Amino acid sequence: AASGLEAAMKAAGKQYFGTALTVRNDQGEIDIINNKNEIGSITPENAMKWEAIQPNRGQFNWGPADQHAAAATSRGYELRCHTLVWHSQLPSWVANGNWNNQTLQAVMRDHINAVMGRYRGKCTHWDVVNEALNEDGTYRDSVFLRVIGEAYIPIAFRMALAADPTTKLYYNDYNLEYGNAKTEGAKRIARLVKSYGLRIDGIGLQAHMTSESTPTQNTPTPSRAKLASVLQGLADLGVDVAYTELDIRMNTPATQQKLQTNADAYARIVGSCMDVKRCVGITVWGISDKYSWVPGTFPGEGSALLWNDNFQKKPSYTSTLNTINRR
Numbered sequence: 001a002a003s004g005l006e007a008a009m010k011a012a013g014k015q016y017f018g019t020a021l022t023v024r025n026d027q028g029e030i031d032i033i034n035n036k037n038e039i040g041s042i043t044p045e046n047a048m049k050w051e052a053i054q055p056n057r058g059q060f061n062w063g064p065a066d067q068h069a070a071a072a073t074s075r076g077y078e079l080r081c082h083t084l085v086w087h088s089q090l091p092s093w094v095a096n097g098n099w100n101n102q103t104l105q106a107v108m109r110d111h112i113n114a115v116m117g118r119y120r121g122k123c124t125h126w127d128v129v130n131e132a133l134n135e136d137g138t139y140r141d142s143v144f145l146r147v148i149g150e151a152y153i154p155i156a157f158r159m160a161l162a163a164d165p166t167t168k169l170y171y172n173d174y175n176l177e178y179g180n181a182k183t184e185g186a187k188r189i190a191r192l193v194k195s196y197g198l199r200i201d202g203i204g205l206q207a208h209m210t211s212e213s214t215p216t217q218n219t220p221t222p223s224r225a226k227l228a229s230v231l232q233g234l235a236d237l238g239v240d241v242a243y244t245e246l247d248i249r250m251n252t253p254a255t256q257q258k259l260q261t262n263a264d265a266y267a268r269i270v271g272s273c274m275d276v277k278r279c280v281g282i283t284v285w286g287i288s289d290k291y292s293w294v295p296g297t298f299p300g301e302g303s304a305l306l307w308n309d310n311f312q313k314k315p316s317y318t319s320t321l322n323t324i325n326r327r
């Protein structure tokens, strides 16, 4: 059996195992990533969001994005580019702008053209629209929805196809794994893009899960079979699927019991990908717990990744690798 996650995915007939990355002076994560049998895809954690790429109108900021893209290209790794149209952390000039339908679209077009154009032939996937849905499956309120309406989603995909047809155009979102109204919303989005005669290549399930009930998420990672049916249901529309931001949080501190329970949760969701032909790959949201978004965003929650604060493999790493390698 293969001894690293990427090699295991390849041996099993999948495309990649990836991770989110922030380039920093601490070499702990990158030294693990350097192993070509371990990781084969990178998602820049922050360097390619709208604020990072165009913080002021017409003034692009390529340095960090170039640096993170180079981390993947210099190693011959795939790159998930993240993300174009997203409500969160929009620059003030976009979020608080005085827009009409036509002028906001011109702004979208200019941004999409410049960023997709620069990294064309490097971005394996693009998260074209991110987190466009409320928890009840209705459209999340943002400047894009207010000014352009529902049509902003297909228009974004039309602009993305024009700027770089060689990439895979993804819709990305969290909490789609549970087979509910939000899952249905993602399907509505995919249907809508296809209705315009446009291309949607994939649906990204972020997979920010829990292994036990937490204050922010009461429902722990569902059964392997349930997750497989959700994945296939999305694949039915004629798209690839992928787990894009996988982490599985618990109430801290961890104990051996909680670590094993967490490992079981990883086996279920990783297994669900193994079960579905159109599930192309898995990206975890970082290598080490040391730099995870979780404890800062939701204090009292954490221990969500495959390596601990000391860059040592947790029980979840072994359960993940074994699950990929199974039969």
Ligand SMILES: *[C@@H]1O[C@H](CO)[C@@H](O[C@@H]2O[C@H](CO)[C@@H](O[C@@H]3O[C@H](CO)[C@@H](O)[C@H](O)[C@@H]3O)[C@H](O)[C@H]2NC(C)=O)[C@H](O)[C@H]1NC(C)=O
Pocket: 101, 102, 147, 148, 149, 151, 155, 195, 196
């Ligand atoms: C802002 O302007 C855009 C055009 O620049 C408007 O987008 C248009 O929206 C309508 C729906 O309101 C789209 O119609 C749909 O077409 C598909 C298939 O072609 C069909 O399945 C639907 O039943 C519906 O008829 C239309 O295609 C779209 N036009 C373009 C060029 O994309 C948008 O409505 C404007 N927003 C506001 C708030 O006024």
